Design a protein around this ligand. Structure first.
Ligand code: NA
Length: 243
């Protein structure tokens, strides 16, 4: 196992140095170069004492866990974080990922988008790293959390790609809803989710307001009645107006 070479492959994805030769470097480490690539970042699990080799233990676990599930992983460190690239399609509820999480501390883990192949994974890396930089700003984040689920936090920290993603992935689909839905959303967010009250203000049954929020969820995938969703819609609508 050549772990200088493993780190150089990870670091070349992190830096966006993704020429063809990256693939042979990876094949050489038993990466299937056709597979999807997902970057995640977290802290290594704290070991029984020893404590600089936490990172080396956690790397080994990660690679073992991958092998056991039929996948490959490459790792590198990013100061006190461990950066892992893992192969294959990746579901939130699936067992590979539950096991993988045991290699990390009981502290945030941020999962980047899945890329089609290793050489396409620079954005996955940049977003997972940006999310990890941003995750302190949502203390209640779930473990794990998607980079794309931290757009307010990344936006407030100055990550341009988060601002763009609020437009492209929240505002643009919102905008498909037309003025009756956006107006209802805006009112509901200002009443703080107080349905009876808002309904009176919008001259409609409570159940019409509820139905219209369920439509907001149809256009955008965010549920205005869930406090996280509602916060993301509200920040996204702001950013929408100021660009
Ligand atoms: Na993957």
């Amino acid at each position: 196992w050549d772990s200088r070479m493993e780190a150089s492959v990870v670091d070349a994805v992190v830096r966006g140095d993704t020429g063809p030769e990256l693939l042979s470097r990876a094949a050489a480490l038993n990466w299937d170069t056709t597979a999807p690539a997902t970057v995640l970042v977290g802290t290594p699990a704290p070991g029984p004492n020893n404590s600089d080799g936490d990172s080396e233990r956690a790397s080994q676990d990660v690679r073992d866990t991958a092998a056991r599930h039929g996948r490959a992983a490459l790792t590198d460190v990013h100061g006190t974080w461990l950066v892992a690239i893992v192969s294959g399609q990746l579901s939130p509820t699936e067992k590979f990922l539950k096991d993988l999480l045991a290699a990390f501390a009981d502290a945030p883990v941020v999962i980047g988008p899945t890329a089609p192949m290793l050489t396409a994974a620079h954005r996955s890396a940049s977003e997972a790293i940006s999310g990890m930089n941003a995750v302190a700003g949502w203390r209640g984040a779930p473990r794990p959390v998607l980079a794309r689920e931290l757009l307010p936090e990344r936006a407030l920290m100055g990550d341009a790609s988060a601002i763009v993603a609020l437009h492209t992935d929240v505002m643009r689909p919102l905008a498909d809803a037309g003025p009756t839905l956006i107006e209802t959303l805006d009112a509901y967010l200002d009443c703080g989710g107080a349905i009876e009250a808002c309904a009176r203000k919008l001259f409609v049954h409570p159940n019409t307001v509820r139905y219209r929020l369920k439509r907001i969820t149809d256009f955008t995938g965010r549920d205005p009645t869930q406090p996280r969703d509602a916060y993301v819609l509200r920040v996204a609508a702001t950013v929408g107006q100021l660009n």
